[PDB]
């Protein structure tokens, strides 16, 4: 039985992304998804009754959802350029994250900062691949990654670095009370 419609073909000259750039974008999509899964594990850790840091839990669950949105934005960009008419199933793979426990809020913030730092470096490498391909400099995608993605990365790194510095100063003598107060401030609660 004929369950589908015989495909039609329309002009394709407008579809211009080159392979190296497209492959770097596909790899970045998997990286964003991997980051969302690692943040979910951080949210889960701080949600435990024996850890009980709801401010940190919410911070990381929010970060997980944001990374999922980053992956979706990259996928939407490829679709807009005429890609992903096939090879969609292989774009992503969900796997358990590498780390599932942290000693305290400082370790988690430093790990998040390092993850963001890795993502920033990876995006800069996608930009290089897309800009320096000898056959096609993808001006628009390079601009999009630079003005949207890197913008979010640098602001995010500075935010995490500041949080880590502020909380770490409290650790030599005020580990419990310092983290407790900092955690409630993440929820907008001034004790």
């Amino acid at each position: 039985t004929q369950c589908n419609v015989n495909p039609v073909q329309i002009p394709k000259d407008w579809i211009t992304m080159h392979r190296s750039c497209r492959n770097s974008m596909r790899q970045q999509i998997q990286m964003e998804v991997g980051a969302s899964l690692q943040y979910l594990a951080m949210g889960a850790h701080f949600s435990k009754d024996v850890v009980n840091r709801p401010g940190f839990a919410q911070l990381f669950f929010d970060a997980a959802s944001e990374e999922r949105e980053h992956a979706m934005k990259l996928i939407e960009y490829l679709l807009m350029r005429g890609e992903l008419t096939n090879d969609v199933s292989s774009l992503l793979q969900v796997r358990p994250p590498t780390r599932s426990s942290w000693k305290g809020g400082v370790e988690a913030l430093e790990h998040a900062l390092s993850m963001e730092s890795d993502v920033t470096k990876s995006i800069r490498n996608v930009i290089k691949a897309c800009e320096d391909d000898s056959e096609f400099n993808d001006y628009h995608l390079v601009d999009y990654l630079t003005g949207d993605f890197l913008e979010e990365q640098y602001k995010g790194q500075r935010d995490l670095a500041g949080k880590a510095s502020t909380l770490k100063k409290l650790m030599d003598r005020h580990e419990a009370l310092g983290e407790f107060i900092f955690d409630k401030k993440l929820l907008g609660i001034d004790v």
């Binding site: 979910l40 996928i75 679709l79 005429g82 599932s100």
Partner: protein
């Protein structure tokens, strides 16, 4: 009978030099001690997580320029967003009950292995969505039975009511909706030798845009 109060009395004694307080946690009703309910709930979060991304890829596929089915794409995007939201909700429930989430926990429910492919024609995609929603629904039935019927020493109506309220009621509506969509497509394909198929898929996609 170990209690949190007794742990405090013991550990807060001048004799002690630690404060373990093993019973001062949120575990009650022996949650996690008997049966598979605790591990099954963790594996249920994992199933929703995996399906959220499978649905996301289907939403992307239907939004490519050749397929360009905004209604089908919206249907899958909604399924993806709901499964993502449920993943977080289940993780929070696992910790609310005093357990900890393990992202590599497997279910004991014997479920066949069938890779999810996002590149499908409309009927195939709806059929797969229907099958995966039935699997999510039957997994909830399984955990519910494990919590209130399968093990003599385990009775956890908190997990049962949580599943009833947050998953079970809505599964019936989603499955009925998807089953109806497959019936509609089946008729477009078979009636009048399938002559109206291309126009029907267009009209059906427009209908999904208005009703999803």
């Amino acid at each position: 009978a170990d209690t949190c109060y007794n742990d405090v009395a013991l550990d807060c004694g001048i004799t002690s030099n630690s404060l373990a307080l093993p019973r001062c946690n949120a575990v009650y009703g022996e949650y996690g001690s008997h049966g598979n309910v605790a591990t099954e709930l963790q594996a249920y979060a994992k199933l929703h997580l995996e399906r959220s991304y499978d649905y996301l890829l289907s939403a992307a596929y239907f939004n490519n320029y050749q397929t360009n089915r905004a209604g089908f794409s919206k249907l899958f995007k909604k399924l993806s967003d709901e499964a993502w939201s449920k993943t977080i909700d289940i993780i929070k429930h696992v910790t609310k009950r005093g357990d900890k989430m393990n992202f590599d926990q497997h279910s004991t429910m014997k479920t066949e292995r069938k890779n999810y492919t996002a590149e499908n024609h409309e009927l195939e995609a709806l059929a797969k969505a229907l099958d995966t929603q039935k699997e999510l629904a039957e997994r909830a039935f399984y955990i519910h039975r494990e919590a209130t019927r399968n093990s003599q020493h385990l009775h956890d109506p908190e997990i049962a009511q949580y599943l009833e309220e947050e998953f079970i009621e809505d599964h019936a509506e989603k499955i009925r909706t998807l089953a109806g969509h497959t019936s509609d497509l089946k008729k477009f394909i078979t009636a009048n030798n399938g002559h109206d198929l291309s126009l029907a898929l267009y009209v059906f996609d427009e209908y999904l845009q208005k009703t999803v």
